[PDB]
Amino acid sequence: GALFVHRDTPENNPETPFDFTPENYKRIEAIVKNYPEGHKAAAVLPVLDLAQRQNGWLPISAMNKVAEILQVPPMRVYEVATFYTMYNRKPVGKYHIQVCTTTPCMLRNSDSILEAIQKKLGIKVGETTPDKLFTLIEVECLGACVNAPMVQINDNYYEDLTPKDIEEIIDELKAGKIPKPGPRSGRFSCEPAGGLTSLTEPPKGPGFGVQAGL
Amino acid sequence: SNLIEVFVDGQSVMVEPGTTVLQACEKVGMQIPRFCYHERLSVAGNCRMCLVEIEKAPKVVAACAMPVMKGWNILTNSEKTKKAREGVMEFLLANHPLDCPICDQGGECDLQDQSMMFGSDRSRFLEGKRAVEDKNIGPLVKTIMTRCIQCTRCIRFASEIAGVDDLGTTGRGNDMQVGTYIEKMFMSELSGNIIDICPVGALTSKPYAFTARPWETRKTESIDVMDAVGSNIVVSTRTGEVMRILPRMHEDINEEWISDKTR
Amino acid sequence: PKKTSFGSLKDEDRIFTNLYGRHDWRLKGAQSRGDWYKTKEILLKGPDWILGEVKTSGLRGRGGAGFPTGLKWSFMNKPSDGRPKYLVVNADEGEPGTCKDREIIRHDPHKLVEGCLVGGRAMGARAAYIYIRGEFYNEASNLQVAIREAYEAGLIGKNACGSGYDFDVFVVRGAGAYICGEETALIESIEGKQGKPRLKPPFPADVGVFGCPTTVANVETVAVSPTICRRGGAWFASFGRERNSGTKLFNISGHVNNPCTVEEEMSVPLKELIEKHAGGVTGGWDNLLAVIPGGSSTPLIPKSVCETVLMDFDALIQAQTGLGTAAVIVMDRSTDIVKAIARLIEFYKHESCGQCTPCREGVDWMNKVMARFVRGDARPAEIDSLWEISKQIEGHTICALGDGAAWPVQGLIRHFRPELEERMQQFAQQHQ
Amino acid sequence: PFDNTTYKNLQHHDYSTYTFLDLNLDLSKFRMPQPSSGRESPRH
Ligand SMILES: Cc1cc2nc3c(=O)[nH]c(=O)nc-3n(C[C@H](O)[C@H](O)[C@H](O)COP(=O)(O)O)c2cc1C
Ligand code: SF4
Ligand code: SF4
Numbered sequence A: 001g002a003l004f005v006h007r008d009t010p011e012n013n014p015e016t017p018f019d020f021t022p023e024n025y026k027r028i029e030a031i032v033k034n035y036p037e038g039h040k041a042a043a044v045l046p047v048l049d050l051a052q053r054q055n056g057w058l059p060i061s062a063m064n065k066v067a068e069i070l071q072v073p074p075m076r077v078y079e080v081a082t083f084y085t086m087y088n089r090k091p092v093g094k095y096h097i098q099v100c101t102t103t104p105c106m107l108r109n110s111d112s113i114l115e116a117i118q119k120k121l122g123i124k125v126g127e128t129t130p131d132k133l134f135t136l137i138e139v140e141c142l143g144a145c146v147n148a149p150m151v152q153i154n155d156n157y158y159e160d161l162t163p164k165d166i167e168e169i170i171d172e173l174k175a176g177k178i179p180k181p182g183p184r185s186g187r188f189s190c191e192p193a194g195g196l197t198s199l200t201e202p203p204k205g206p207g208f209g210v211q212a213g214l
Numbered sequence B: 001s002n003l004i005e006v007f008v009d010g011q012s013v014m015v016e017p018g019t020t021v022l023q024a025c026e027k028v029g030m031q032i033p034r035f036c037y038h039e040r041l042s043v044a045g046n047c048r049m050c051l052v053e054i055e056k057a058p059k060v061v062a063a064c065a066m067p068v069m070k071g072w073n074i075l076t077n078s079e080k081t082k083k084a085r086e087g088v089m090e091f092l093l094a095n096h097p098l099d100c101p102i103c104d105q106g107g108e109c110d111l112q113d114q115s116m117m118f119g120s121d122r123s124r125f126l127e128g129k130r131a132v133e134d135k136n137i138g139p140l141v142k143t144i145m146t147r148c149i150q151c152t153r154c155i156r157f158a159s160e161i162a163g164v165d166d167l168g169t170t171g172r173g174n175d176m177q178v179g180t181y182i183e184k185m186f187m188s189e190l191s192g193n194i195i196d197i198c199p200v201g202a203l204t205s206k207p208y209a210f211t212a213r214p215w216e217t218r219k220t221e222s223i224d225v226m227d228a229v230g231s232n233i234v235v236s237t238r239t240g241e242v243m244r245i246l247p248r249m250h251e252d253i254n255e256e257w258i259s260d261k262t263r
Numbered sequence C: 001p002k003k004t005s006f007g008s009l010k011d012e013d014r015i016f017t018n019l020y021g022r023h024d025w026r027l028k029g030a031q032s033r034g035d036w037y038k039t040k041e042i043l044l045k046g047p048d049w050i051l052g053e054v055k056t057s058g059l060r061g062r063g064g065a066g067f068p069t070g071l072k073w074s075f076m077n078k079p080s081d082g083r084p085k086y087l088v089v090n091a092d093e094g095e096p097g098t099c100k101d102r103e104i105i106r107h108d109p110h111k112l113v114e115g116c117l118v119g120g121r122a123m124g125a126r127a128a129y130i131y132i133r134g135e136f137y138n139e140a141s142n143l144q145v146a147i148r149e150a151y152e153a154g155l156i157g158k159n160a161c162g163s164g165y166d167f168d169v170f171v172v173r174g175a176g177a178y179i180c181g182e183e184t185a186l187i188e189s190i191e192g193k194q195g196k197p198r199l200k201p202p203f204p205a206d207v208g209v210f211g212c213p214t215t216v217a218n219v220e221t222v223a224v225s226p227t228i229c230r231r232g233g234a235w236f237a238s239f240g241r242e243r244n245s246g247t248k249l250f251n252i253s254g255h256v257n258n259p260c261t262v263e264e265e266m267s268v269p270l271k272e273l274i275e276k277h278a279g280g281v282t283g284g285w286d287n288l289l290a291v292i293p294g295g296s297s298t299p300l301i302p303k304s305v306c307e308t309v310l311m312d313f314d315a316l317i318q319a320q321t322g323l324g325t326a327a328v329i330v331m332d333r334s335t336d337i338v339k340a341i342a343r344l345i346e347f348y349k350h351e352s353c354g355q356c357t358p359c360r361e362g363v364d365w366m367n368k369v370m371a372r373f374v375r376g377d378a379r380p381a382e383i384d385s386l387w388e389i390s391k392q393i394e395g396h397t398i399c400a401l402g403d404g405a406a407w408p409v410q411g412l413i414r415h416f417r418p419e420l421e422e423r424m425q426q427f428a429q430q431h432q
Numbered sequence D: 001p002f003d004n005t006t007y008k009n010l011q012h013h014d015y016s017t018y019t020f021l022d023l024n025l026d027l028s029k030f031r032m033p034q035p036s037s038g039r040e041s042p043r044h
């Protein structure tokens, strides 16, 4: 969790059952073939991420299994697991809400988004609802700054958010439906709101402007 | 004829290619300050205590890792070098604990001594300090990890010399921690050597704890008889009693290591 | 002849013609807009011709440092020893305020893939690894779909585009770390370690990913290269002031009416860029407080500087800042400028890899001081103290993240020192 | 047929947990054989 030392518990110890399913073992094979022979350790990050997609989070047994598959020392897998922030070393809720609070999103009122989520779910930053459906955390810039304020829920970005929009999104999740990702304001992606200021003409076709000699 | 000419404060020295700036200064008897660098470990370049000015180069280089180039003039005592050392020493001491009276390293501490020779004489750090949990790695090496300066010497020793990959860093940034992550004992026949290489009191001898200060010991250079290698050792005594055993460098025998039984 | 006013880029001269994703992003749509056109001829022209075109265009790195691309890529133009050679495409995109590379990956993936091939050919690389930040999952999947289409059309893989050159494009996802955008930290992450930057030398072109010769290039730098080859370096070099050539993707965020991504000519005035494309500053130009012109790592500039500054590498260096990634963050007069910068320091504190002393300890130190400056719980002598601390970090670290955390502090102290002292005065009076 | 008014990047609304790794598994057949360092790992 917040700590970077591991203490065994009944729910997280070397004997906690974990193993890759037969389908994930085929995915691991293709992952490992993307790298030169003699450098299997390159597959630690994607294989560790796969273990988290199958299981939701990474028990210490999952880290040991990854180290065994790739034949790297287990400590070199613990270092990766604790270095990178997308690995969950404690269980998380079904929907991991990640709100960006870095300056560009703060300037467009990411706090009101954060305050709205806490009210609707009745939790605080870093908590899981007693249903174990939602976990709320703050994150650094998610790479969608022009669509601020925005959140990521699992793999999906939800952008151009107001307090009403995020509440609608959470209700859809609570009702067992995944809402559509992308801006909720009116625009589709990153174009300026209120009409295109560029790229309004039909794009040119092949060979336009090609230099002589080709 | 492969040697190249470089200068240390204007004095010419001929060095073979691949020699680092730090090694070039050694040849003229100048010891660059260091924490992470150890000549028997892989270069790390992370402590930044070895930063030095190259004449006409606007940026200081890490003397321990930078290969020296023909014609370079290394200024080991310029204001630019001295200000780099003072800055780095200041960062090292910001979160370091006020432990010298209770810390066994006191009196033979490279942090203490290099702070005296190369650091400022006062603090301008007005915040609270980091505090770290202690890790249990067996009955030989005590850990007080709040004193760790993250030089990674122990990690590189365990991996490269001892062939054990149990030590690493977990976390990131200011909360980066040296340890084993899980509860694990670093039991190797060469484990005790990480006490010597650790520049600070983070790793200390548990059997030796609290029994003596370095200045009061007498050094008797002697030989190990625990096996047939014949490791060279220093026997520390005080007022007629043996206090500890330390390695004594012998390039052709034990280098600067000893086994745990010897130690 | 030598145009002196820049901007007003026409649509025909825009490279990323699907920037807003209103046309098909898959192979058929990309080929209709001119992607993958005469790629075989470009590859057969040889590495020297491609590198010559890139050198002539005056292209500079779009990743934040702005090194001349043509010279940089030419480090790989050397005979092969035993080792393979690799092109690594930096799609980490972590700099706060920067979201341009996201648009390229999901809307013009085939420009990136074709750029990998052309750029890889110029360097003699056998494969391209595209490192994309782990959060960009849907963007990565779009890119993976486009790569599959390229393999099935014979454009990449064995005998790419029928040129006889073998090339692979791999996608590797990060796992949440801003430092993995740093070129050597990116390589370490691909090799399965913590993303901790390497010291240099060696340089990646000598010892890179898997210990092999490598070039790390930004997504935007790679994606423009096929067009620079098709339309010539001269055409690209005709935009912007000399040594600041080409078109550029700009993100405008913060307190503007229409935050947006847009492609505009290099050396365009900053004020014109905000007004024409972003719909002006919220509350009008007179409501502007400061701008961060190139992402979080560039020093902020105050309104007075923003009136006349041009958006290119040299112009912003004159303003004691930098172009960076060209991510313009606008702050109006209602902004708490101290809190805004204090939040960036907190970002760098959370992103420091912790490897080297001045950043591991120094950035955390600056974060604590800035937190007290926000509340005013400090004394004016600590301002010059903070300045000196930032100078002890800058230039003493392994990688440029330490520099990037020191520069915002220096910009705040340089341009808003009275605001700091005013707040210290308020706190003392209120508490006394 | 020049419609510059709809968003044509809707495919990712249907992506799932294993979309990325399924594409990588699909791509596996198109790759060139990897180079070799000459040993199973740096610890061999
Ligand atoms: C902390 C840090 C983060 C960086 N992040 C990125 C990034 O996300 N994308 C990028 O292209 N370059 C990034 N860079 C710059 C790269 O190290 C490198 O200069 C760049 O990828 C070179 O490509 P270019 O010459 O085409 O710009 C970063 C640098 C630092 C120090
Ligand atoms: S390690 Fe050195 S400086 Fe730190 S408390 Fe011990 S003796 Fe003092
Ligand atoms: S415990 Fe000692 S040797 Fe290991 S990293 Fe810390 S200071 Fe260095």
Ligand code: SF4
Pocket (backbone or CB within 6 Å): C179, C196, C197, C351, C352, C353, C354, C355, C356, C357, C359, C360, C397, C398, C399, C400, C401, C402, C403
């Ligand atoms: S400057 Fe910071 S991020 Fe860069 S290597 Fe040093 S500690 Fe790591």
Ligand code: FES
Pocket (backbone or CB within 6 Å): A100, A101, A102, A103, A104, A105, A106, A140, A141, A142, A143, A144, A145, A148, A150, C096, C097, C098
């Ligand atoms: S600052 Fe929030 S997405 Fe960039």
Ligand code: FES
Pocket (backbone or CB within 6 Å): B033, B034, B035, B036, B037, B044, B045, B046, B047, B048, B049, B050, B051, B062, B063, B064, B065
């Ligand atoms: S001794 Fe050179 S950086 Fe530590």
Ligand SMILES: [K+]
Pocket (backbone or CB within 6 Å): B105, B194, B195, B196, B197, B198, B199, B200, B201, B202, B203, B204
């Ligand atoms: K020690």
